[PDB]
Design a protein around this ligand. Structure first.
Ligand SMILES: CC(C)(COP(=O)(O)OP(=O)(O)OC[C@H]1O[C@@H](n2cnc3c(N)ncnc32)[C@H](O)[C@@H]1OP(=O)(O)O)[C@@H](O)C(=O)NCCC(=O)NCCS
Ligand SMILES: [Mg+2]
Ligand SMILES: [Mg+2]
Length: 219
């Protein structure tokens, strides 16, 4: 009953953990990336890459470092796309072949009200009214935050550009889907235009997991 696996296609292997297993190490090439980091950050960095290497192995890729670009993005092997996320009680990664999908993003958050002031900073005025109308029993504010994070993670590998909270309008459906409408220039690096993303969401184990897969276009 893994969360990521329940919201991405079977052809995108994923792996996740809810605690840091004892004894894990970064690969040698990864050590400089967390040398200056606090211990909590070291732990999540190491464990999420353990998960990513597990998923990569399913695609036939043996142990390899996963470094980071200047904008924080993970640097995947040739022919691979993927995404990672970590929060209190969750580390997760998903990967896929560029021959199968264009991009993927995921995000995890605890299923609770957003911290004070955060919803105001992330939500368009219309989004706030929309969330107020969704069915009781779900922290839709936190789900919106997650979906916004996921939208940027799926977007950046295809554009190499920023996407702020105000640059996409996210509509959440109670049925476990959402849509992200892009409000900025959507020209992508493959010549196409990105105007909207389709996403999926699940709440389980006290956590929200959101995911966007950007499909390949028809030939
Ligand atoms: O803030 P956040 O980066 O959204 O925090 P999350 O925990 O949700 O996910 C963090 C991961 O997003 C990924 N990420 C960071 N910047 C990114 C970007 N510009 N594009 C795509 N993915 C990115 C990284 O893999 C990071 O994990 P690492 O720093 O351990 O490699
Ligand atoms: Mg994190
Ligand atoms: Mg996040």
């Amino acid at each position: 009953d893994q969360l990521i696996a329940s919201v991405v296609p079977e052809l995108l292997p994923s792996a996740e953990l809810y605690e840091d297993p004892p004894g894990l190490e970064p690969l040698p090439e990864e050590e400089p990336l967390i040398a200056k980091s606090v211990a909590k950050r070291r732990n999540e960095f190491i464990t999420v890459r353990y998960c990513a290497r597990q998923a990569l192995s399913v695609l036939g890729i043996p142990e390899v470092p996963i470094l980071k670009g200047d904008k924080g993005q993970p640097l995947w092997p040739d022919g691979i796309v993927g995404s990672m996320t970590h929060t209190e009680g969750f580390r997760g990664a998903v990967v896929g072949r560029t021959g199968e999908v264009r991009s993927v993003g995921i995000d995890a958050e605890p299923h609770d009200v957003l911290p004070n002031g955060v919803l105001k900073s992330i939500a368009l005025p219309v989004e706030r009214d929309e969330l107020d109308a969704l069915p009781a029993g779900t922290h839709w504010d936190r789900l919106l935050f997650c979906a916004k994070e996921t939208t940027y993670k799926a977007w950046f590998p295809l554009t190499a550009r920023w996407l702020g909270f105000e640059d996409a309008h996210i509509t959440i459906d109670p049925d476990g889907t959402f849509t992200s409408r892009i409000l900025v220039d959507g020209r992508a690096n493959d010549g196409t235009v990105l105007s909207a993303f389709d996403g999926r969401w699940i709440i389980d184990k006290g956590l929200i997991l959101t995911a966007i897969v950007v499909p390949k276009l028809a030939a």
